[PDB]
């Protein structure tokens, strides 16, 4: 998948303003991430789209149909989208299986086709052995995965996922996220993810909308957000940074306590502001010979948002490395791989 | 702080084993992190400590007093610890102010001392302007912080914190955890945190217990857990790693297709195994000319699991970086330009 457009949307609770003149589009098949500080309005936005909250002005359209505006306000039932709530509350008196079955057909999961879709959701999320559990019989991350499976089962053209993975250990989240998003993309599905995992957003988002106090500071690709953030607030939200008051010079540097540093800016010389350094930009020299120095050949370089993925031939194997930046090889190909420190060795009774 | 002793503790549900021969110890004022894959038994362990669940076997003692055993089983209200449940669960019919007041004195929050302590908790967690709200008027991360404020207000000698920060954006979680753990340490408090944030555990834990399928895989300092893991299983849970089939040599190197690499092991030469390299150990050379170079002097050097914390006098600042004798001269390089934001 669905297109979505939200135009000038605003929402207040009593004297409490929360969404302030928000505009946002989602293209068919697009994976959009919405991120921002606690309390900035993410869940309220999703609830306004799904019809659980009523905006007090603005417009919302979904796949070419107005669903909210000065003269329309469709019931939740008439809004063709899926919405995994941040609470992920399951029906207490239903089994995991029957929770997942709920949004398919008559809800009972008696048909072979339902059984097969439900089992596929259980396998994706790694909870097949818990199909007969009731929700009170589950850990926090097991309950989270069952809620995710139930949301995903009907495979809506648009799905809104409000922190679908926040209770899950890293390796688990990484597997589910990759398998799930590949499958959404394979099927042309549109999705909006709320996340506060910076690496997740940078890796998987087509575009990221960064919110602050009910407004959108910036909506951009991961590469543009990270390297060309609109604001210092956006820059600090998307990554760690070390900041100093600074005065811009005319030669592409700025002065700060640390020193005179090259800086990306087109503002006039004499502008005052703040300069930000990413911790990965620093190194200290000289350096000891590395534990191992190996000769390597660069096969392929692929820029990502905040790193470059390098394909390598070193010794007699090929590795892929993620590094803050690419090496300068007068050759374009000839490099030296360093290992810092001993590796670990495990005798592996496999 | 209060010391804690858990001894050969187990628990099954129905006929479903969930905690299996847990032993675990906490010295006064120690900060322990418990981590492990989803379903491994972290919350069940905490519930058994707090008396919400009853173990089948084993002993729990608190500051030297046996609280669970074959012959003893102190009710919840009698166990002198605080416990922040992974759901948080605020009292829905009380404001945030009265929720945080609840564990102080008569719960009314009418004494100047109570008002002061509630203000301290509202400020630590950044929710001062929400203190008049009810829980259903709050965002998920605000509800989480109010629940944390409520649990921390009585300042118990032992506090159990099951995922107290999981709904919070990075800057917020960093500030709250730095301020709060510094305060706990300054006051000598003992704390057990459950987390799945690896950096967090490695930075703040005095020890980390890694659980797997109901058992303790390894309990150790962050340095030991990360640099001497018990298990390729434990190694990969605590951090990333690139692996290679390798064969052990006798000079403390291992053969693998990448080369003859120095390795840490005591095993017998000839042992075939897996070599594991952490991503931080890799670099590719040569690097580009640096955008800038700043002369620096090393002030101090604090070893951590994945890096060393170095204090440096450079230009006209002191900078502290995660990246050598503590008085040496060195040069800081900056790779690429910094960003500049007009005021
Ligand atoms: N009534 C019950 N019957 C059977 N198993 C149960 C019951 N209650 C909990 N469990 C199981 O106990 C195991 C441990 O649960 P616990 O909540 O302690 O895990 P956790 O480590 O805190 O998980 P997470 O990281 O997902 O929060 C889980 O596998 C869960 O399925
Ligand atoms: N009934 C209400 N009355 C007044 N303010 C409310 C009410 N409900 C929510 N809010 C406020 O609206 C703002 C947006 O809340 P929302 O749940 O959308 O935030 P969020 O970005 O999802 O936050 P988090 O990251 O903490 O989950 C918050 O500051 C919250 O306190
Ligand atoms: Ca939210
Ligand atoms: Ca748990
Ligand atoms: Ca070989």
Author numbering:
A (entry chain B): 2 to 351
B (entry chain A): 2 to 324, 330 to 349
Sentences from the paper on this structure:
ABC transporters form one of the largest transporter gene families and use ATP to power the movement of a wide range of substrates across the membranes of both prokaryotic and eukaryotic cells. The TMDs bind the transported substrate and the NBDs provide the energy necessary for transport by binding and hydrolyzing two (or sometimes just one) molecules of ATP. We have solved the structure of the native nucleotide-binding domain, FbpC, from the N. gonorrhoeae iron-uptake ABC transporter, FbpABC (Lau et al., 2004). The first 240 amino acids of each FbpC monomer show the same overall ATPase topology and sequence motifs previously observed for other NBD structures from ABC transporters (Oswald et al., 2006).
FbpC consists of 352 amino acids and the structure shows a domain-swapped physiological dimer in the asymmetric unit cell (Smith et al., 2002). The crystal structure was determined to a final resolution of 1.9 Å and refined to a working R factor of 18.6% and Rfree of 23.4%. A notable feature of the FbpC structure is that it is trapped in the ATP-bound prehydrolysis state with a divalent metal ion cofactor, even though the protein is an active ATPase (Lau et al., 2004). A divalent metal ion is found coordinated between the β- and γ-phosphates of each ATP and the Q-loop glutamine (Gln87) in the electron density maps of FbpC. Given the high concentration of calcium in the crystallization conditions (0.2 M), it is highly probable that the ions observed in the active site of this structure are calcium. A striking feature of the FbpC active site is that neither of these residues makes any interaction with each other or the γ-phosphate of ATP. This suggests that the presence of calcium in the cofactor-binding site may have caused the catalytic dyad of His197 and Glu164 to adopt an unproductive conformation, although His197 still makes the trans interactions to the carbonyl oxygens of Ser167 and Leu169 on the D-loop of the opposing monomer as observed in HlyB. FbpC also contains an additional C-terminal regulatory domain of ∼110 amino acids (RD; residues 242–352) that adopts two OB-folds per monomer. Unlike MalK, the domains in FbpC undergo a substantial domain swap between the two monomers.
